[PDB]
Structures are given as structure tokens and as C-alpha cells.
Design a protein around this ligand. Structure first.
Ligand SMILES: Nc1ncnc2c1ncn2[C@@H]1O[C@H](COP(=O)(O)OP(=O)(O)OC[C@H]2O[C@H](O)[C@H](O)[C@@H]2O)[C@@H](O)[C@H]1O
Ligand SMILES: Nc1ncnc2c1ncn2[C@@H]1O[C@H](COP(=O)(O)OP(=O)(O)OC[C@H]2O[C@H](O)[C@H](O)[C@@H]2O)[C@@H](O)[C@H]1O
Ligand SMILES: [Mn+2]
Ligand SMILES: [Mn+2]
Lengths: 154, 154
């Protein structure tokens, strides 16, 4: 039995007995490789005070399913379209939030549309090296993209 | 300039202009392989109403650094100790929270201590197959462990 403390724009804060629970819209993220570069994006994220390396990601809006949201945010954030394949999903931090991320692969990318969101094409090997040297932070989606590449796309 | 709406046990809810921000303690997670099985754990997570496949994880408590927290939660959740190596970190969902997870590898595991938290040794290949068939959900830490294994531990 959830009692609500806050109903907001992209989250609700609830108590469920002793548990603090943040309800959040589901998200999507897209892994895309071109000429050995992965498609990352960076934007200022006020929650962390910096711009981590992410892959294109967004929230699922009313009416959409994950595939449609993935197509939309790839086009909105990078101007690209591709052939999308569902990979897997994960709960970002299920000890306090229900946010679930659905991750897709994009292939055969084409420009459909010509630095709020900065597009950062970067070899995943270099992203991993920059992170190990302390030069860039990852979001979960960025790290999942780099690990998925090393596991399956070489 | 953050104004606080809620100060709680494992999170704070703040507004920073138009942004809803959840402050949260940093976390650790430990990837451990033994005889081709990865060390997963499962527990009921009221935020999601189910028990996703995770790897041993916990919050960093006052006084600790990530390595020490990782040692602690491995022992508390599974009764094991090992030789720990830092791998990488990630922000779980930097569009709304500052929670950061530090991920370690554990090797040479030994039992130091003899189903609140269920220990689930499982080959990562099988965890990935069960997830693809809809039989289990992943946390970010579980998915990162499975992807890291496939990338680097075969
Ligand atoms: N929603 C909550 N509200 C209030 N207290 C809680 C909650 N969840 C746990 N506790 C209390 O907080 C103590 C912390 O339990 P520890 O093992 O260090 O952490 P973890 O495994 O939960 O979270 C580790 C990560 O894994 C997941 O991705 C999480 O989202 C984190 O990112 C618990 O004993 C409870 O007393
Ligand atoms: N903290 C916030 N509070 C209020 N509104 C916000 C906030 N952040 C963004 N908006 C608004 O919400 C709209 C959503 O922007 P979209 O691209 O679909 O999502 P995403 O990239 O932010 O989040 C995608 C995932 O990546 C990260 O891991 C996140 O944590 C998510 O898990 C924005 O245009 C803003 O209008
Ligand atoms: Mn976005
Ligand atoms: Mn735990």
C-alpha cells in the first residue's frame, strides 16, 4: 500500500511501509556501431553535475511501445534511423525505483534529419580506456553498450 | 540551488529548477565466477514487485570506501570473501538520480561464514537465455555481470 509524497513530471515518490519507492517511466536505449565507432551522446545532467558518456536513450511516452520510443529518440537525439532489434532489458536500480530500460541494437543507419545533446562517435575500446583513466564517467546505458560490443560485436 | 522535498533513509528528493533529483548513496557490486557459474543473488524488491537477477550489491556506508563496502556485502549476502579488483563505475540513471555504482571482480573465493537474500549460482549463458525467454528479469548489476563475463572472462 503506497502512499504518495510527491507526484511529478518524470517521477513519483511513494512510501510502501518502510520502503522509499520512486516510480519512473520506462526508458529505452540504442546501441549502434558504424565503422568501429559506437554512437554515444553526452548532455549536462543536473542530477550528477556532469555529462557522462551515454548511448541515445529516452523515456517511453504515452502511446508508444519500446521499439517506437527507441526509433524516436535515435532520430531526435542524433538525426539517424536504423533497423532496430530488441536485445534485453534491465531495472536500473530495483532497490528503490521501478525504472526499466529496454535496449535495442540499430544497424544500417541513415541520416533522416540534419549541442544540447552532443553526438560522440567513439570506438568502444577508447571509451573504456578513457573511463579507466578517469577522463569520462559512464551511465549504465553507456557501459552496457561498451560491454555488449566487446562481448558480441567484434 | 536544491530545495528539498523529502529527506529519507536511502534517498532525498530535491528540486533544482525544473529538475526532479533523487540523491542516493553510492553502491557497489561484485562480479564473481566459480567453475563457470556466476554468483547471482535474488531478493524481493518492493519497488518492482519481483525478484530480479542481481549480483551481490550494497550501499557504501559511512566510513567505507568502495572496496570495503564490496568486501562487506559479499560476505553479508553470500558468506564469501575473495581477492577484489576494481573494474569500472557507472551512474545508474543520471537523468534523475546521482546514484553511482562501483563494480569489482572477485577471485579466489572462500567461505568465511556459513532466503531473505537467495544465492543463485548460475552459468551466465543460462542467465542470458532465461532472460531472453522471459523467465527472469535483470537488474543493471546482473546484466553488467553477464555482459562483462561474455566480453572478458571466457
Ligand atoms: N527502497 C528502500 N527504502 C528504504 N530502505 C531500504 C530500501 N531498500 C533497501 N533498504 C534498506 O537499505 C539497506 C541497504 O541494503 P544494501 O544491501 O546495502 O543495498 P541494496 O542491495 O538494497 O542496494 C544495492 C544496489 O542494488 C540495487 O540496484 C539497489 O537499488 C542499489 O543500487 C537494506 O538493508 C534495507 O535496510
Ligand atoms: N530530472 C528531471 N526532472 C524533470 N524533467 C526532466 C529531468 N530530466 C529530463 N527531464 C525532462 O524529461 C524529458 C525526457 O528526456 P528523454 O530524452 O526522453 O529522456 P532522458 O535522456 O532524460 O532519459 C533517458 C534515460 O537515460 C538516463 O539514464 C535517464 O535517467 C533515463 O533512464 C526531457 O526532455 C526533459 O524535458
Ligand atoms: Mn535522452
Ligand atoms: Mn544488497
Amino acid at each position: 500500500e503506497r502512499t504518495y509524497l510527491y507526484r511529478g513530471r518524470i517521477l513519483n515518490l511513494a512510501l510502501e511501509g518502510r520502503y522509499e519507492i520512486v516510480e519512473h517511466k520506462p526508458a529505452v536505449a540504442v546501441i549502434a556501431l558504424r565503422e568501429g565507432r559506437m554512437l554515444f551522446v553526452r548532455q549536462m545532467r543536473p542530477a550528477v553535475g556532469l555529462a557522462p558518456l551515454e548511448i541515445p536513450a529516452g523515456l517511453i511516452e504515452p502511446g508508444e511501445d519500446p521499439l517506437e520510443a527507441a526509433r524516436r529518440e535515435l532520430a531526435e537525439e542524433t538525426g539517424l534511423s536504423g533497423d532496430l532489434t530488441y536485445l534485453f532489458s534491465y531495472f536500473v536500480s530495483p532497490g528503490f525505483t521501478d525504472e526499466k530500460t529496454h535496449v535495442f541494437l540499430a544497424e544500417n543507419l541513415k541520416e533522416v534529419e540534419a549541442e544540447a545533446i552532443e553526438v560522440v562517435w567513439m570506438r568502444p575500446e577508447e571509451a573504456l580506456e578513457r573511463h579507466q583513466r578517469g577522463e569520462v564517467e559512464f551511465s549504465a546505458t553507456g557501459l552496457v553498450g561498451v560491454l555488449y560490443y566487446h562481448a558480441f560485436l567484434r
